[PDB]
């Protein structure tokens, strides 16, 4: 609603231009007349104080044991039906003291404890679902840290980050930004790394959900979480929703699923609507990451739902060296290990294997209370990770 700050962010002069001065003095004159305008009338008309008298009378009209209940329906204004504490419905009378605006059908209502009526709305406790996927800040991974993938970082920048920092570009050519991005590649290529990189330099509520939690126990509590996921995203202003391992909504079978595949499909048919249905969309951008782009219904990937398909290949030899350097940056090597010699250990190392080598190297140096990794540590590190 209204914003307490930012009375007039007219910083267009951005200098000592006199235009800044004229507006400021305007309020000062209005303030002066208001001062004696309120106190003067507050003496010969000592009916309402507006500071202690106003609040006082309403409190008496309220009750000491204020009740809490659920508003069930909105009958004509000044009248509503509110569900009592346990199981009863009362045709209460709405009092004007309430804002009369936050009366959503089912949020909350405060009622007098004897003549039950509407006395006031109650803000709804942050539902546990919102807190579950409300990623605050990406801990450490920056955007120059990712390294390697270069032509693939421009697509994500140009779909989920540019339209929020420089909208003019998709503002003068009359082109709406590409709807979504789907990331696909072998197991371990930076798919999620780039996914959390965008969360770093972003100004929107990031939400993350893995494909495995989209499949639930009871029937119907399937394509109902999908509705909740996109209901939270809309309520939270600009937001990037990240679905990870989307290939778990029909690639993995779980006994907890009361309904079998037939139930999982209806989850997809609800996810299909939530990405492109005849409802309004607003500002919500979907990033889907998967390691098997060939095992999902070719309608979830239809242009319009997800537009830009980004392909993540196994690291190139030149990029392999960059991966080692970034991961080994904060490591006191023993000027005896050569990075180039370990670049060729197996025909194709994902890159997540590179970090595994550089992380097991340290654990192989801790065992000897040594703060310098030698070629022996890496040699045994390169065998304990990608061999067994």
């Amino acid at each position: 609603g209204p914003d307490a700050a930012s009375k007039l962010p007219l910083v267009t002069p951005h200098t000592q231009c006199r235009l800044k001065l004229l507006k400021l003095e305007r309020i000062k004159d209005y303030l002066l007349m208001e001062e004696e305008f309120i106190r003067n009338q507050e003496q010969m008309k000592p009916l309402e104080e507006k500071q202690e008298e106003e609040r006082s009378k309403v409190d008496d009209l309220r009750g000491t044991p204020m009740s809490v209940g659920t508003l069930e329906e909105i009958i004509d204004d000044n009248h509503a039906i509110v569900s009592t504490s346990v199981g009863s419905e009362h045709y209460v009378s709405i009092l004007s003291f309430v804002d009369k605006d936050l009366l959503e059908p089912g949020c909350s209502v405060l009622l007098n404890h004897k003549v039950h009526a509407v006395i006031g709305v109650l803000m709804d406790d942050t539902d546990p679902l919102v807190t579950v996927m409300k990623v605050e800040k990406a801990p450490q991974e920056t955007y120059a840290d990712i390294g390697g993938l270069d032509n693939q970082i421009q697509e994500i920048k140009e779909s989920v980050e540019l339209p929020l920092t420089h909208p003019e570009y998709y503002e003068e050519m009359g082109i709406k930004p590409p709807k979504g991005v789907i990331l696909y590649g072998p197991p371990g290529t930076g798919k999620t790394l780039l996914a959390k990189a965008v969360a770093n330099q972003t100004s929107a509520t990031f939400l993350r959900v893995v494909g495995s939690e989209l499949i639930q126990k009871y029937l119907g509590d399937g394509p109902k979480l999908v509705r909740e996921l996109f209901r939270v995203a809309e309520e939270h202003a600009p937001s990037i929703v990240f679905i990870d391992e989307i290939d778990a909504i029909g690639t993995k079978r779980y006994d907890s699923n009361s309904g079998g595949e037939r139930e999982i499909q209806r989850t997809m048919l609800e996810l299909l609507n939530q990405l492109d249905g005849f409802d309004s969309r607003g500002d919500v951008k979907v990033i889907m990451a998967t390691n098997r782009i060939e095992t999902l219904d070719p309608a979830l990937i239809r242009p319009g739902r997800i537009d830009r398909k980004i392909e993540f290949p196994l690291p190139d030899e030149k990029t392999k060296k960059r991966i080692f350097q970034i991961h080994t940056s904060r490591m006191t090597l023993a000027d005896d290990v050569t990075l180039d010699d370990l670049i060729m250990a197996k025909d194709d190392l994902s890159g997540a294997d590179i970090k595994a080598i550089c992380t097991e190297a340290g654990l192989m140096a801790l065992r000897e209370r040594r703060m310098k990794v030698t070629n022996e540590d890496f040699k045994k590190s390169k065998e304990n990770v990608l061999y067994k």
Partner: protein
């Protein structure tokens, strides 16, 4: 058509118009709050006021 934004002095030359918005080819309503056009001096109006009666005249370009 769109709201009016003033850039009398800004650190960067931001475009005068926020977005093109609607650009329906068919005849449609024109909003009162008009602003400056784009760049390249293409189809630039002569009236410069948008008094609801501005007339457009074609010119010779790139013969």
């Amino acid at each position: 058509p769109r709201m009016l934004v003033t850039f009398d002095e800004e650190l960067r030359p931001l475009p005068v118009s926020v977005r093109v918005g609607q650009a329906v080819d068919v005849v449609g309503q024109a909003g009162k709050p008009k602003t400056i056009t784009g760049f390249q001096t293409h189809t630039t109006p002569v009236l410069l006021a948008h008094g609801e009666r501005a007339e457009l005249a074609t010119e010779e370009f790139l013969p």
